[PDB]
Amino acid sequence: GSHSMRYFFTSVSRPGRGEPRFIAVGYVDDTQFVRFDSDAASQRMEPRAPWIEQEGPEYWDGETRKVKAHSQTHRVDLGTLRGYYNQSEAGSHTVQRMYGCDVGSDWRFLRGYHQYAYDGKDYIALKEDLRSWTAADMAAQTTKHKWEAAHVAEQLRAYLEGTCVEWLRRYLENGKETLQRTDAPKTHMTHHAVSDHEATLRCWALSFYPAEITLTWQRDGEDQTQDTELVETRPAGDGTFQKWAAVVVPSGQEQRYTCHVQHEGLPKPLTLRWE
Amino acid sequence: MIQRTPKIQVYSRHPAENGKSNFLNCYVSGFHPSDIEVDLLKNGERIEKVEHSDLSFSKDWSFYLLYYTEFTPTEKDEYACRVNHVTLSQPKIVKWDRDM
Amino acid sequence: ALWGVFPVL
């Protein structure tokens, strides 16, 4: 299957009480491997996954070097935007940056990213052509201008179609056991009566990886979409994910309903039926 | 400014089995801003030794953190997640149900 | 590994 490497950056200004808080994390598919926290003691890029601890001091000194630069960068970004919108320096604001690359099953470049968001609204993003930008307002447009002269896109392109892909692949290899693993979900069904004329049907999908999944309920073959309780795929905390979907059923019809599970780690799609 | 309200999910890593060791989770997601209060409660009391994943977000910029802690289910015991955000007028409390 | 260039808004 295809894979990706993403870097999430969050900076929050805390006026009147120190320097803005900066958090940085990075992923390979759904596994986090490194992190950096401005409020932490180390003031260093730290590992968050086993398969990266191997990397020597060069890697850690380099990433600690780059990560700090990012922090400073978004520390300034807060300033700039604060002016781009004539905002009170009293209020706290947020800046989010997320860049990375995707590769197909062939481990070849498939598309890259580089997007921003100020206080939750899309600010500026790199288009697919990796050669142009999407400015939202006049502010983002002014930034787009700067990045156009500075020829930022071209540079970012090299990173995305090159270095980025190459590290993903490396990490993919060095982490074969984890990153390249798959765990078909462990599916089971629970039945608890709500009343003397109804029952709840819960379909479970546990300990699976990656997070991509499709858990569906069907009555006599028809999707019960709009009548299904579907929680967000959540993390077990052990590296695997969980998920469930439930429907309220008229006591006596449990057999009409079927749960359908779809996961990249299942030879064929699952079909469970209470009985 | 944008204010997305947090989805709260309180559950356990492994299926609960009274007596057996586990991890009690409270997954908060889709909120914004990131400033957020999260607590795991045992019979109403706040639990101390409680950690949380590193601040991260999804495609739409909404944040998501995982609050977990080691614990051991008991028939008599009740655990819950208390959460706070600007989007919440008062702390939202969710009880743990070993079937959700 | 992080990108080596550090653009500004």
Spatial separation of the C-alpha atoms in residues B93 and A268, rounded to whole Å: 40
Classify the C-alpha dihedral A17-A18-A20-A22 as positive or negative: negative
Instruction: Check CB contact under 8 Å for A70 and C6.
Output: yes
Which residues in chain A are contacts of B99 at CB distance < 8 A?
190, 192, 202
Question: Per 3-state DSSP, what percentage of chain C is helix, strand, and coil (rounded to 5)?
Answer: 0, 0, 100
Letter for the amino acid at A229? Answer: E
Q: Which of A80, A99, A159 sits opposite C9 (nearest CB)?
A: A80
Residue A230, CA distances (Å) to A127, A226, B10, B54, B91 in order: 32, 10, 15, 25, 24
Which residues in chain B are contacts of A26 at CB distance < 8 A?
none
Which residues in chain B are contacts of A242 at CB distance < 8 A?
11
Q: Looking at the 3D structure of chain B, how many domains does it have?
A: 1
Residue partners of B33: CB distance under 8 A and separation at least 6: A12, A94, A119, A120, B1, B3, B63, B86
Residue partners of A27: CB distance under 8 A and separation at least 6: A4, A5, A6, A7, A8, A33, A100
Measured in angstroms, the CA of A263 and the nearest CA of chain C are apart by 29
Spatial separation of the C-alpha atoms in residues B51 and B47, rounded to whole Å: 10
By the 10 Å C-beta count (0-12 exposed, 13-18 middle, 19+ buried), A237 is classed as buried
Nearest CA in chain A to C9: A143
Measured in angstroms, the CA of A167 and the nearest CA of chain C are apart by 7
Q: Which two tokens stand for residue A72?
A: 């400073």
Residues 16-75 of B with CB under 8 A from A: 23, 25, 27, 29-30, 32-35, 53-57, 61-63, 66, 68
DSSP string, B38-58: EEEEETTEEPSS-EEPPPEE-
CATH number of the domain residue B18 falls in? 2.60.40.10
Which residues in chain C are contacts of A59 at CB distance < 8 A?
1
Range of the domain at B66: 1-100
Spatial separation of the C-alpha atoms in residues A257 and A249, rounded to whole Å: 8
Instruction: Check CB contact under 8 Å for A159 and C7.
Output: no
Instruction: Report all structural domains of chain A as residue ranges with CATH numbers, in order of start.
Output: 1-181 (3.30.500.10), 182-270 (2.60.40.10)
Which residues in chain B are contacts of A10 at CB distance < 8 A?
34, 55-57, 63
Overall residue count recorded for chain A in this entry: 275
B5 touches chain A (CB under 8 A): no
Method: X-ray
CB A200, CB A192: distance < 8 Å: yes
Vertex A62, ends A58 and A67: CA angle to 5°? 150
